[PDB]
Amino acid sequence: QLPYSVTLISMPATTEGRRGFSVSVESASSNYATTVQVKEVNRMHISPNNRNAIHPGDRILEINGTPVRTLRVEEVEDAISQTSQTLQLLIEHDP
Secondary structure: OOOOOEEEEEEOOOOOOOOOEEEEEEOOOOOEOOEEEEEEEOHHHOOHHHOOOOOOOOEEEEEOOEEHHHOEHHHHHHHHHOOOOOEEEEEEOOO
Protein backbone atom coordinates (compact mmCIF):
# COMPACT_ATOMS: atom_id res chain seq x y z
CA GLN A 1 0.00 0.00 0.00
CA LEU A 2 2.66 2.49 1.27
CA PRO A 3 6.08 2.80 -0.41
CA TYR A 4 8.82 0.47 0.82
CA SER A 5 12.25 2.05 0.35
CA VAL A 6 15.73 0.59 0.87
CA THR A 7 18.97 2.60 0.69
CA LEU A 8 22.60 1.45 0.58
CA ILE A 9 25.09 3.99 1.96
CA SER A 10 28.79 4.03 2.79
CA MET A 11 29.87 6.11 5.79
CA PRO A 12 33.55 7.13 5.75
CA ALA A 13 35.82 6.65 8.74
CA THR A 14 35.63 9.38 11.38
CA THR A 15 36.85 10.09 14.91
CA GLU A 16 35.76 8.32 18.09
CA GLY A 17 32.12 8.80 19.08
CA ARG A 18 31.13 10.61 15.87
CA ARG A 19 29.47 7.89 13.76
CA GLY A 20 26.34 10.05 13.91
CA PHE A 21 23.67 7.62 15.10
CA SER A 22 22.77 5.08 17.77
CA VAL A 23 20.64 1.94 17.52
CA SER A 24 18.18 -0.09 19.55
CA VAL A 25 18.94 -3.79 19.06
CA GLU A 26 16.25 -6.36 19.82
CA SER A 27 17.52 -9.90 20.42
CA ALA A 28 14.59 -12.32 20.42
CA SER A 29 16.53 -15.59 20.69
CA SER A 30 20.09 -16.25 21.86
CA ASN A 31 22.46 -13.26 21.52
CA TYR A 32 21.72 -12.55 17.84
CA ALA A 33 20.46 -9.17 16.65
CA THR A 34 16.92 -9.84 15.44
CA THR A 35 16.13 -6.26 14.39
CA VAL A 36 18.42 -3.22 14.38
CA GLN A 37 16.54 0.09 14.53
CA VAL A 38 18.06 3.57 14.35
CA LYS A 39 17.36 5.32 17.65
CA GLU A 40 18.97 8.78 17.45
CA VAL A 41 20.64 10.72 14.64
CA ASN A 42 23.10 13.63 14.90
CA ARG A 43 22.99 15.07 11.38
CA MET A 44 26.10 17.23 11.81
CA HIS A 45 28.17 14.09 12.50
CA ILE A 46 27.08 12.57 9.16
CA SER A 47 28.72 13.43 5.85
CA PRO A 48 26.59 15.70 3.61
CA ASN A 49 25.94 12.95 1.04
CA ASN A 50 24.39 10.65 3.67
CA ARG A 51 22.84 13.25 5.99
CA ASN A 52 19.31 12.67 4.63
CA ALA A 53 19.67 8.90 4.12
CA ILE A 54 19.28 7.68 7.74
CA HIS A 55 16.48 8.71 10.10
CA PRO A 56 15.20 7.72 13.55
CA GLY A 57 12.95 4.69 13.19
CA ASP A 58 14.83 3.33 10.18
CA ARG A 59 15.92 -0.31 10.36
CA ILE A 60 19.41 -1.51 9.45
CA LEU A 61 19.06 -4.68 7.38
CA GLU A 62 22.73 -5.35 6.58
CA ILE A 63 26.07 -4.15 7.97
CA ASN A 64 28.94 -4.22 5.45
CA GLY A 65 26.93 -6.72 3.42
CA THR A 66 26.05 -9.07 6.29
CA PRO A 67 22.40 -9.52 7.34
CA VAL A 68 22.10 -8.39 10.94
CA ARG A 69 20.14 -11.47 12.07
CA THR A 70 23.37 -13.50 11.72
CA LEU A 71 25.40 -11.10 13.90
CA ARG A 72 25.73 -11.06 17.66
CA VAL A 73 24.49 -7.98 19.50
CA GLU A 74 28.08 -6.97 20.32
CA GLU A 75 29.17 -7.31 16.68
CA VAL A 76 26.45 -4.89 15.53
CA GLU A 77 27.43 -2.28 18.11
CA ASP A 78 31.17 -2.77 17.52
CA ALA A 79 30.68 -2.06 13.81
CA ILE A 80 28.85 1.20 14.58
CA SER A 81 31.31 2.35 17.26
CA GLN A 82 34.52 1.37 15.40
CA THR A 83 34.76 4.77 13.74
CA SER A 84 38.18 3.90 12.27
CA GLN A 85 36.36 1.65 9.77
CA THR A 86 34.25 2.58 6.78
CA LEU A 87 30.70 1.44 7.53
CA GLN A 88 28.36 0.25 4.78
CA LEU A 89 24.67 0.08 5.69
CA LEU A 90 21.54 -1.26 4.02
CA ILE A 91 18.75 0.89 5.46
CA GLU A 92 15.02 0.17 5.30
CA HIS A 93 13.20 3.50 5.47
CA ASP A 94 10.17 3.75 7.75
CA PRO A 95 6.82 4.77 6.15
